[PDB]
């Protein structure tokens, strides 16, 4: 009843952003909406004038620094399926180092954000990638459990047919996992990106 | 799993109780959107106002207090510490299923799990102050 605010020009053109001045690093200013209203408080009714600036986060930094390291860690974990089952220390090194790399990535990913008490899309992606890496380690554990003898193929002897010195057979678990794990990870990536991008 | 009741106290700096007396109104402490605030790690349970008299060297002063009850939220810390520690413990359990003749593999697995625990302990304390008791 005492002071009322109005926009000088029409509301859309009453707020102007200089084209040269833009100090956003990880955001894109899509536009601005301009409006006015009232606020009711104990002291009385006050005119409020509002401008909502619409911002969209830029994904490139996080793609470079979180998603690609996680994807490469998953691929590195899945690489171990192509080694012979008798390379126990080597495959254990693969599994353990990939698990720790995923753990470190999970720890470092949340440092960017404020300490919010809910899971984000990046958190879900990291969780799925950790699940893949840990499942690969379990796969190696199963292969080692079913391994019989502790020496690999000599190089010259002729593996007779399962149907002298015997030798371990190539693991059916490894043969299946070699195609199963990359296919499932690719399907997960497809569904995840299709879910979260066009939103 | 901690909960706190943080105070906000005010009073007259100069004038003792015989000169200025404060009093709460009928509906004195009002709030708008409680859970649209900047409380990320905490949730606002409620508030309560009180009044008392505090004796100082200058005199007795009417002190007016508002306590805000805050309850911590488990999500961030569950992501950060609990899940990785349990996962590393399970990674340690994986050693039991490896052949005992795999000496370097099992030894590296165990010692590496103990390393990742030292590191997880070290980083779990970062958010807290340097208190001298176990949480």
């Amino acid at each position: 009843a005492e002071v009322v605010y109005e926009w000088t020009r029409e509301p859309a053109r009453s707020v102007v952003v200089a084209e040269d001045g833009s100090r956003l690093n990880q955001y894109d200013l899509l536009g601005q909406t301009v409006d006015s209203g009232i606020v009711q408080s104990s002291t009385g009714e006050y005119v409020v004038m509002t401008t909502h600036f619409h911002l969209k986060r830029k994904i490139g930094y996080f793609v470079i620094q979180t998603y690609l390291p996680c994807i490469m860690t998953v691929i590195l974990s899945q690489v171990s399926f192509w080694l012979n089952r008798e390379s126990v220390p080597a495959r254990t090194v693969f599994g353990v180092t990939t698990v720790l790399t995923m753990t470190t990535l999970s720890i470092s990913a949340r440092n960017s954000l404020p300490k919010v008490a809910y899971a984000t899309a990046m958190d879900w992606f990291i969780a799925v990638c950790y699940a893949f890496v840990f499942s690969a380690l379990i796969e190696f554990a199963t292969v080692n459990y079913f391994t019989k003898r502790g020496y690999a193929w000599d190089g010259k002897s002729v593996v007779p047919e399962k149907p002298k010195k015997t030798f371990n057979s190539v693991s059916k678990i490894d043969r299946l996992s070699r195609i199963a794990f990359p296919l499932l990870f690719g399907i997960f990536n497809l569904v995840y990106w299709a879910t979260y991008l066009n939103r | 799993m901690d909960e706190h009741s943080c105070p906000l106290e005010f009073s007259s700096y100069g004038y003792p109780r015989e000169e200025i007396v404060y009093q709460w109104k009928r509906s004195s402490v009002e709030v708008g959107d409680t859970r649209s605030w900047r409380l990320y790690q905490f949730s606002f349970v409620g508030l309560r106002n009180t009044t008392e008299v505090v004796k100082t060297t200058s005199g007795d002063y009417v002190v007016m207090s508002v306590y805000f009850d805050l309850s911590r939220r488990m999500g961030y810390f569950t992501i950060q510490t609990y899940i990785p520690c349990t996962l590393i413990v399970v990674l340690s359990w994986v050693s039991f299923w490896i052949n005992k003749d795999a000496v370097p593999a099992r030894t590296s697995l165990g010692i590496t799990t103990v390393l990742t625990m030292t590191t997880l302990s070290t980083i779990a304390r970062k958010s807290l102050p340097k208190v001298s008791y176990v949480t």
């Epitope: 909406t33 009232i38 408080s41 | 959107d33 409680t34 859970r35 649209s36």
Partner: nanobody
């Protein structure tokens, strides 16, 4: 005539979302009547400025609309909406949650 339309939200905390009221008579596009923000700031359409009033109870997670000066041109279906106002706060597209809707009729 006077009337009151309430809209209570369950399953999600709509306190931190802008909550709005819309109207849609048959053969009409959903039009914005009112809205209220997290900061207790109220917006009204030009057709309904000064007649209808919007309020919110954040503890109960509800938005109420008191309709005054009802007229037979006002008969329509009234929708409750809530969401984050992105490119909107006056357009139905920006609200990601909607109610069933309630019919209102005035007879002279």
């Amino acid at each position: 005539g006077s009337l009151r339309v309430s809209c209570a939200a369950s399953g999600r905390t709509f306190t931190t979302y802008i909550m709005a009221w819309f109207r849609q008579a048959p053969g009409k596009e959903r039009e914005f009547l009112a809205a209220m923000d997290q900061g207790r700031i109220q917006y009204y359409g030009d057709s309904v400025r000064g007649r209808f009033t919007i309020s919110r109870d954040y503890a109960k997670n509800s938005v109420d609309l008191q309709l005054d000066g009802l007229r037979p041109e006002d008969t329509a279906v009234y929708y409750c909406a809530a969401g984050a106002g992105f490119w909107g706060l006056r357009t139905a597209s920006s609200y990601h949650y909607w109610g069933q809707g309630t019919q209102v009729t005035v007879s002279s």
